[PDB]
Amino acid sequence: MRIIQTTGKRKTAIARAVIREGKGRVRINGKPVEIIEPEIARFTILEPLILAGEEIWNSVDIDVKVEGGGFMGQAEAARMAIARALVEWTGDMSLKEKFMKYDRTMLVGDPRRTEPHKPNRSTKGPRAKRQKSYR
Amino acid sequence: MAKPLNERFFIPHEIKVMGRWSTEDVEVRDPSLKPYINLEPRLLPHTHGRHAKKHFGKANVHIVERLINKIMRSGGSHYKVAGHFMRREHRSLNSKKVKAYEVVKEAFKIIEQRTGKNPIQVLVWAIENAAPREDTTSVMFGGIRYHVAVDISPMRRLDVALRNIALGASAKCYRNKMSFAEALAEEIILAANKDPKSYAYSKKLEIERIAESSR
Amino acid sequence: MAEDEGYPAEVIEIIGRTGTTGDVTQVKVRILEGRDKGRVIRRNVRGPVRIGDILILRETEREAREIKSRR
Amino acid sequence: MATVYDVPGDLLVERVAQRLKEIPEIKPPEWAPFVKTGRHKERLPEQEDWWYYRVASILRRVYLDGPVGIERLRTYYGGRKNRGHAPEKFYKAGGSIIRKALQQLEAAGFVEKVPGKGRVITPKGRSFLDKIATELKKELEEII
Amino acid sequence: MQKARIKIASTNVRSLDEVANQIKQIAERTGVRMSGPIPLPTKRIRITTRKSPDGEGSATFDRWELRVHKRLIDIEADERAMRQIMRIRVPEDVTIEIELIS
Amino acid sequence: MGKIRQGFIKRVARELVNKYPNEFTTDFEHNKKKVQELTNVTSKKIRNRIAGYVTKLVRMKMEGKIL
Amino acid sequence: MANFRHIVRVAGVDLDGNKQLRWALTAIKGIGINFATMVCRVAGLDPFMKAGYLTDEQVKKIEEILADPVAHGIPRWAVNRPKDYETGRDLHLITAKLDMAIREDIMRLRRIRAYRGIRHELGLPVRGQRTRSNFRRGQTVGVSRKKK
RNA sequence: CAGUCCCUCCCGCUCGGGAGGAGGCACUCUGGGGGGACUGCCGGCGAUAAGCCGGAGGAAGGGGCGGGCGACGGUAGGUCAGUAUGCCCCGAAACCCCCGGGCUACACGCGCGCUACAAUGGGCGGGACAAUGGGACCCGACCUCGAAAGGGGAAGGGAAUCCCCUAAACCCGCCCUCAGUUCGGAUCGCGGGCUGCAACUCGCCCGCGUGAAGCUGGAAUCCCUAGUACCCGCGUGUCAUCAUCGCGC
């Protein structure tokens, strides 16, 4: 084998992704990629697997550990990481251009992630105001 | 349960868009919404991904995400938990874009089985028709008030089409024993033929008709 | 449709805005697939439009359209 | 490879649930579906299914995890009691599908309580949760 | 030798590695093998108060925050080295806790 | 807001291209060697803006009017 | 089918629908959603089955189970009333029994001269907390019981 | 078991998947320092100025972004019922001690919230997922009895090292068969738990029965501009107890 080590982060899911020579093992958090019940976020991982790694996938072992509470946050944290990991293995930069087939999240992140809540006029939430009928 | 999940995973890989449909079969022949209907997707056209770049970055959003958003809209302040529950997914989707995604997918299976065409071929044809093509804006310069003929933006046509179509579908579904999947599918069929039976064509006419009267 | 109700026309230039409403922006259109095969008209459009877009024109006969001024 | 790591859990739980009907030292006791149900529900089941999926599901977790109490199996996706117009809070589930199950996997030995104070797998519990995936490794590794 | 964990919690930004790289100076009076300062988290305390006593109308309430920033240093050395460190700990500014294991 | 700058940035940059006019550049990486030493510091972000104006000022002597 | 009728009477001459077994037993007072199924297991009848198509034999089973719960089982926070009138060990409730039992204890409390009791008498909540400005718009308080 | 000579465990179609300790600091991460963005550069418009648009490199850009920061003063705004304080009054008292009560009384009206009206569904079951924080008469591992509220025994932890702790939305299959109800939780009976001298008046929680009003809202009116709103749960505070509250994630 060999070790190439990359990170992705989307939405405070942090992906610790190792790509090693293999035989087509997909492990995410210890577990199969074929356990995943939500349809939507599964399909998310599936984009680099026929748009960055047509034949590479069967041939290589990708293990990730994806540490967030999201599931489109984990799905897209993991996607960055796998996406980048596949393109390095083949040594092509012609798969860097298969991240231009959709809105960037396979190599570029967001400078803004949250706003802390404000006390407002006394009501929850960061931006908000209460109804106004004081009479 | 598990074998079905494996297969539901297989079909998009092989390659298929969304589930088992092809984006390939269309009949977009309208030059207006030619550059605002997006045919790049080959796996998913709702991820999360997004635009806030520019105003026509908004009409470059892949058609089905915009559709998901329009389907999602109504649902007030409630409380979704295991319980015994209710009611919650409203009657028009209290929950996430995640839940919204499922209906559109189901609706796509019912409508393909019926029409014997892809739901893309039906929906795309339906948006070209369902969209009104004239509006009046109140434009005064100098004091004198004219209510002259004004042309809709291409982006404004796409939004209005999507909005009418969802909105109307829901309207009979409410307090009723339909599957929504059916309701949605049936609204898309009549909107596409240009029948005044759909709520979509009603509004398409009424907006242009009022514009013709002011004009 | 595939030729519409409309008369399709493409925007040669976006001249400026009219109203004191702001609401309409005035944009110069030339038709080549619709009513005429060379006419230039200055129509009143609403909302976002930028050079090179395609605009479907419904007015080709009344030719009431306001000319002045950008404020 | 035949381990539960490799194989979607959904099938492993489903397999076990129908072989606990064959073991057959585990069954529904009368008391449990009667009113001694995990919280209150819309409709209380009379089925064999309810119980057998609940035992089958417990046997599976202790293998993948370390010690697993009876304090973290009260809810797992829901396990709430309706508090009126005040919003729902979690509450501690029926003992007649958690604790009672783990003491009949101690007459089967499949799980055991350690002198370490916890719950742990035995190899007879991993010769009954790894004989369920020797039969199939082709409809669950067709897209690994 | 005896292993000491010196755990050093500080309210100041620049008193935290200035007493975690210059407490190596205090410490050493005999030979020592020392671990470079390992950053532990900021543990964050918030306390939010109303600045308004009346509360009325619209109001803006002060959310305060004190961030206490932690470094952990290990040292393996004699009794005398450990002592230097617990003999003086200044005004605080710097809380010094010591854990003793062989 | 908008990209407008108050004259405090403008004040310090103007003084420095008074001393040595031709010993400043249109390159931003030399005007943070000489510049850095001379100019009033309280941040790195403030340092860049005065530095930006000393850079900009050199380009303006080229085009035939310098503030 | 599994009978010639579409309405069977069980738990007495109280009606059983054409919809669901579970729903119809809840509808008969003193026979709740949970209680329906406690009898259903003992008599033996499926949980998912249509109302309105039972054997004659089954009708007999529901009445005897209700009459003396104690023979059959029935835990001592599952039975309708345990410790009845502070001196009776156990009884049960059915439709006719539920009216009388609650009405009595309510009547008692009035006699005792309870605060709780007099408030009921007026038509007011006690442990319902507020009566402040809720039931707004001239409306009904709500309170017990069925009429739909 | 990143990566591994070593070491303990399980299964195998004995290919191969996972974890602990030696060991390793790579990675993920943590806080301290540094760099990076400034219309800096280039073209256009423009007085060659101020400034506006476009392009390139790039992770980001043209106040990058979100907060903090708010003058002289005024509405005779609010707090002498938090403290300070002018003045005036009170001295078995407008003081001082104590038990009991009320602030939630209710035909209603108005302010601010919440729950909610079912098949876009619920139940049942299974599987994938947190983050901020707080924690020694305190969090409470795990083990037993109870459907439960709770009790009994007991480990560790004054904290990246242990505990609360698995989030919830999500999704698949079945069951249900679309009523004012298996919706919805009002009110109330009986049984019980907990705190305190005590929870009728004014507590919460559970089990069994009860199951109301409500079936999509008139005039009229309110909120918000991006990681925001729509929407989902979680934590914390005050703290014996009342949360559909407040602060925060």
Side-chain angles (χ1 to χ4, degrees):
Chain A
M1 69 181 73
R2 62 174 178 188
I3 183 170
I4 292 193
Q5 280 185 117
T6 193
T7 192
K9 173 188 184 168
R10 292 288 323 250
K11 283 173 290 162
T12 75
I14 300 152
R16 169 159 164 241
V18 184
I19 181 153
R20 53 167 188 199
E21 180 73 286
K23 63 169 205 306
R25 170 81 176 139
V26 188
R27 188 177 60 139
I28 175 169
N29 293 100
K31 315 298 173 68
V33 63
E34 296 159 287
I35 198 167
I36 306 177
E37 282 294 348
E39 307 286 297
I40 310 74
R42 199 180 53 245
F43 299 164
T44 322
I45 308 174
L46 199 57
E47 290 166 77
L49 313 178
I50 199 65
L51 210 59
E54 287 71 80
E55 300 175 96
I56 316 160
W57 190 37
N58 291 88
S59 301
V60 90
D61 266 12
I62 319 175
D63 310 280
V64 66
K65 307 196 168 178
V66 189
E67 299 164 65
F71 207 86
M72 192 54 76
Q74 296 189 130
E76 299 186 78
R79 174 187 172 182
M80 182 173 284
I82 293 175
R84 292 178 61 174
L86 293 159
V87 181
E88 287 173 274
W89 205 263
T90 185
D92 283 335
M93 290 309 166
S94 51
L95 295 181
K96 283 289 199 71
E97 298 186 56
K98 293 300 182 48
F99 304 163
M100 308 278 175
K101 294 283 210 298
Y102 196 89
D103 301 307
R104 316 302 266 88
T105 191
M106 303 171 97
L107 180 49
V108 189
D110 296 289
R112 310 103 183 159
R113 297 198 190 283
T114 210
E115 204 188 276
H117 295 194
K118 279 69 169 285
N120 315 294
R121 84 185 273 160
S122 192
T123 182
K124 302 184 183 161
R127 295 197 169 188
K129 180 175 178 174
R130 311 195 292 198
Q131 300 179 103
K132 190 165 181 183
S133 291
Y134 308 92
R135 70 189 55 172
Chain B
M1 294 185 290
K3 307 166 291 179
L5 203 60
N6 294 11
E7 303 302 334
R8 290 154 189 206
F9 194 55
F10 236 129
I11 309 162
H13 189 46
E14 54 142 354
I15 202 168
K16 301 289 190 51
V17 199
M18 206 180 190
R20 49 162 194 193
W21 302 276
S22 311
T23 193
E24 301 312 310
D25 296 87
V26 276
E27 52 179 334
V28 46
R29 301 266 180 247
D30 198 1
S32 187
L33 311 160
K34 195 166 298 294
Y36 303 108
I37 285 158
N38 299 110
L39 296 177
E40 195 168 62
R42 35 71 291 285
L43 215 317
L44 277 174
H46 172 50
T47 291
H48 168 70
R50 70 159 186 189
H51 307 57
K53 317 178 191 54
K54 47 152 179 44
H55 318 264
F56 283 104
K58 303 299 177 62
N60 298 146
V61 176
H62 314 92
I63 61 278
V64 191
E65 183 174 301
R66 313 201 58 72
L67 184 52
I68 280 156
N69 155 224
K70 295 282 163 65
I71 296 283
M72 173 292 294
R73 85 289 165 179
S74 311
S77 302
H78 319 279
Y79 203 69
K80 167 60 190 175
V81 270
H84 61 41
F85 313 44
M86 51 273 261
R87 172 318 173 271
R88 286 55 63 204
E89 305 71 282
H90 193 83
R91 301 193 292 198
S92 185
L93 288 295
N94 190 28
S95 305
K96 307 268 294 184
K97 294 201 188 179
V98 292
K99 178 51 204 185
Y101 190 90
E102 188 167 313
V103 192
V104 187
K105 201 171 189 308
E106 200 179 324
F108 288 2
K109 310 169 188 68
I110 297 295
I111 194 189
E112 195 203 29
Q113 282 182 144
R114 300 164 174 174
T115 304
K117 301 168 177 300
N118 277 161
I120 314 300
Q121 186 167 9
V122 216
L123 181 76
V124 165
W125 183 226
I127 58 183
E128 298 165 280
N129 301 328
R133 302 189 151 84
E134 200 156 25
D135 70 287
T136 199
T137 306
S138 294
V139 170
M140 55 279 286
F141 190 91
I144 192 163
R145 286 204 58 199
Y146 266 96
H147 296 71
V148 273
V150 186
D151 303 301
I152 190 166
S153 304
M155 178 259 284
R156 184 64 56 243
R157 291 190 79 231
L158 186 68
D159 284 68
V160 168
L162 293 172
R163 192 170 301 108
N164 296 343
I165 289 164
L167 180 59
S170 306
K172 68 211 173 183
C173 202
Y174 290 148
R175 245 310 300 264
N176 201 51
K177 291 188 195 193
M178 282 182 179
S179 315
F180 196 32
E182 308 176 54
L184 189 50
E186 187 181 83
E187 176 78 332
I188 296 176
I189 299 171
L190 302 170
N193 294 353
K194 291 175 290 303
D195 286 303
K197 185 79 157 194
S198 56
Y199 303 93
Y201 211 82
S202 306
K203 309 172 175 145
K204 177 277 189 304
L205 290 177
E206 187 70 59
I207 299 171
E208 292 187 310
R209 261 54 292 161
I210 295 179
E212 276 289 321
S213 299
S214 294
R215 170 183 176 181
Chain C
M1 318 200 152
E3 193 50 86
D4 307 301
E5 297 192 97
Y7 294 106
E10 289 85 49
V11 296
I12 57 168
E13 292 177 73
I14 175 176
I15 171 160
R17 58 192 189 218
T18 33
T20 188
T21 188
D23 191 313
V24 156
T25 298
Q26 172 155 239
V27 170
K28 303 183 304 180
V29 215
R30 170 171 175 173
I31 315 196
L32 284 177
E33 307 286 298
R35 199 281 185 141
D36 302 298
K37 293 306 161 290
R39 201 172 65 171
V40 177
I41 187 173
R42 280 150 179 207
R43 284 291 297 93
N44 283 143
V45 191
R46 61 75 64 182
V49 159
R50 291 153 200 271
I51 191 175
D53 287 307
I54 180 169
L55 187 66
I56 308 306
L57 309 182
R58 286 309 299 264
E59 180 194 282
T60 20
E61 307 302 44
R62 183 178 182 194
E63 216 152 338
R65 28 69 52 199
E66 300 292 287
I67 188 157
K68 55 197 282 283
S69 301
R70 163 176 284 242
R71 248 60 171 85
Chain D
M1 71 201 191
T3 51
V4 297
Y5 294 110
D6 311 280
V7 183
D10 295 287
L11 186 279
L12 291 164
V13 60
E14 158 174 281
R15 191 52 49 214
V16 171
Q18 294 205 106
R19 287 170 46 160
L20 281 165
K21 299 165 183 183
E22 283 177 356
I23 199 49
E25 304 184 62
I26 290 204
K27 65 290 183 292
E30 178 71 49
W31 67 67
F34 214 71
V35 59
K36 301 196 187 197
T37 73
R39 309 309 308 150
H40 179 69
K41 302 174 166 298
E42 186 194 64
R43 183 192 53 156
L44 279 53
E46 297 185 11
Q47 315 175 342
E48 287 171 59
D49 301 301
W50 177 58
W51 163 277
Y52 286 123
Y53 269 110
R54 272 286 180 201
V55 185
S57 190
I58 300 184
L59 181 51
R60 183 173 179 284
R61 301 174 170 134
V62 181
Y63 184 27
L64 287 302
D65 310 295
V68 179
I70 55 181
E71 277 96 25
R72 303 177 179 177
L73 302 180
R74 298 290 149 156
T75 171
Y76 178 61
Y77 56 97
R80 322 196 158 238
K81 176 57 211 208
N82 181 23
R83 297 189 60 229
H85 308 297
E88 301 205 308
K89 296 294 168 307
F90 306 121
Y91 267 103
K92 286 180 52 191
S96 301
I97 20 168
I98 312 175
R99 76 187 174 265
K100 284 319 179 288
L102 279 164
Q103 297 165 239
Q104 296 162 247
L105 291 165
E106 288 183 290
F110 300 164
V111 294
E112 189 165 62
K113 64 202 166 175
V114 50
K117 335 190 53 64
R119 194 64 69 175
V120 285
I121 42 285
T122 66
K124 293 178 297 296
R126 301 186 265 194
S127 289
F128 190 70
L129 187 66
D130 292 301
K131 294 199 182 164
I132 58 159
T134 307
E135 35 182 298
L136 297 165
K137 207 62 157 69
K138 51 178 205 64
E139 279 181 331
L140 294 154
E141 295 275 273
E142 48 161 52
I143 199 169
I144 176 77
Chain E
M1 315 175 173
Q2 294 167 115
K3 195 179 181 287
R5 297 183 59 178
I6 301 303
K7 192 177 299 310
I8 184 165
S10 181
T11 200
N12 302 127
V13 174
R14 290 280 81 227
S15 298
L16 183 52
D17 286 294
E18 303 193 73
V19 198
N21 292 104
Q22 312 173 17
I23 198 182
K24 297 182 146 65
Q25 317 291 99
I26 304 168
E28 196 181 279
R29 272 316 180 276
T30 184
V32 306
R33 179 242 48 126
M34 215 139 168
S35 192
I38 309 165
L40 305 169
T42 311
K43 306 303 185 286
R44 294 185 169 107
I45 184 169
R46 294 181 266 216
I47 290 174
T48 306
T49 47
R50 299 197 180 221
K51 287 182 294 167
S52 57
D54 63 78
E56 304 166 348
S58 298
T60 292
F61 304 138
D62 205 281
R63 173 143 59 105
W64 304 73
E65 40 169 63
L66 152 56
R67 285 191 311 198
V68 177
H69 330 275
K70 305 185 156 64
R71 297 275 180 272
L72 173 62
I73 313 172
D74 294 340
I75 174 186
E76 281 170 46
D78 304 290
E79 178 62 59
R80 171 182 183 208
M82 301 322 167
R83 201 163 293 274
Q84 297 284 280
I85 305 183
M86 302 295 296
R87 178 181 38 73
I88 181 171
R89 58 184 290 196
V90 285
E92 309 175 37
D93 307 276
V94 272
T95 285
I96 304 209
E97 188 172 75
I98 187 164
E99 302 194 68
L100 217 277
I101 35 168
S102 300
Chain F
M1 293 198 180
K3 202 274 299 306
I4 186 68
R5 294 143 69 174
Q6 224 185 98
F8 186 41
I9 291 152
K10 307 184 185 193
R11 179 153 50 169
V12 190
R14 202 169 298 172
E15 288 177 54
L16 241 75
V17 298
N18 307 145
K19 311 167 181 180
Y20 289 134
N22 306 351
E23 292 187 326
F24 296 111
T25 48
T26 55
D27 171 277
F28 191 56
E29 309 299 313
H30 292 73
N31 285 1
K32 220 165 63 177
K33 292 184 184 167
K34 189 168 173 34
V35 183
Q36 170 173 22
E37 310 163 339
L38 294 158
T39 196
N40 297 305
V41 182
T42 183
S43 197
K44 180 207 180 165
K45 177 164 163 167
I46 198 159
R47 199 192 327 143
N48 286 27
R49 294 186 179 216
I50 301 173
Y53 221 57
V54 169
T55 308
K56 187 172 158 46
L57 279 161
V58 171
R59 179 168 63 157
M60 285 144 72
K61 288 197 169 61
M62 313 173 74
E63 289 174 277
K65 169 183 169 75
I66 179 249
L67 276 185
Chain G
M1 318 311 218
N3 189 219
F4 52 100
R5 313 179 287 247
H6 310 282
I7 292 177
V8 307
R9 282 69 167 182
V10 288
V13 82
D14 297 67
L15 319 178
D16 196 78
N18 188 226
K19 299 172 295 296
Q20 210 174 356
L21 191 70
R22 296 284 69 68
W23 287 33
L25 291 164
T26 312
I28 315 170
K29 318 194 296 298
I31 306 179
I33 170 64
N34 302 270
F35 222 70
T37 191
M38 300 173 190
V39 325
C40 175
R41 295 182 187 68
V42 180
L45 269 178
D46 309 279
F48 55 87
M49 77 187 290
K50 289 283 188 184
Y53 295 108
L54 300 166
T55 72
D56 299 295
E57 305 165 43
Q58 305 293 113
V59 181
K60 324 179 186 180
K61 291 188 176 182
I62 306 294
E63 312 181 322
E64 52 175 66
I65 301 163
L66 289 159
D68 287 296
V70 283
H72 301 281
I74 312 312
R76 288 287 302 186
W77 282 277
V79 49
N80 293 157
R81 294 169 62 96
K83 185 56 66 181
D84 71 271
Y85 69 102
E86 283 77 45
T87 194
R89 200 186 83 90
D90 199 271
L91 283 188
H92 200 67
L93 310 173
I94 202 164
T95 198
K97 279 180 111 171
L98 177 76
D99 300 286
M100 183 207 185
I102 307 175
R103 189 248 51 237
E104 194 187 285
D105 295 326
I106 291 189
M107 191 151 78
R108 192 230 295 133
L109 290 143
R110 296 165 164 183
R111 280 188 311 245
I112 289 191
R113 297 175 305 180
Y115 202 109
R116 176 158 284 294
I118 299 185
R119 273 171 161 207
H120 312 309
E121 214 192 289
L122 300 181
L124 299 171
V126 199
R127 61 184 189 190
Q129 190 178 18
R130 285 175 60 255
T131 47
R132 171 150 63 178
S133 298
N134 63 348
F135 49 96
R136 58 190 174 209
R137 318 262 185 275
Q139 300 279 94
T140 196
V141 188
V143 320
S144 304
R145 48 188 73 168
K146 192 163 301 288
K147 53 176 169 318
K148 295 277 181 183

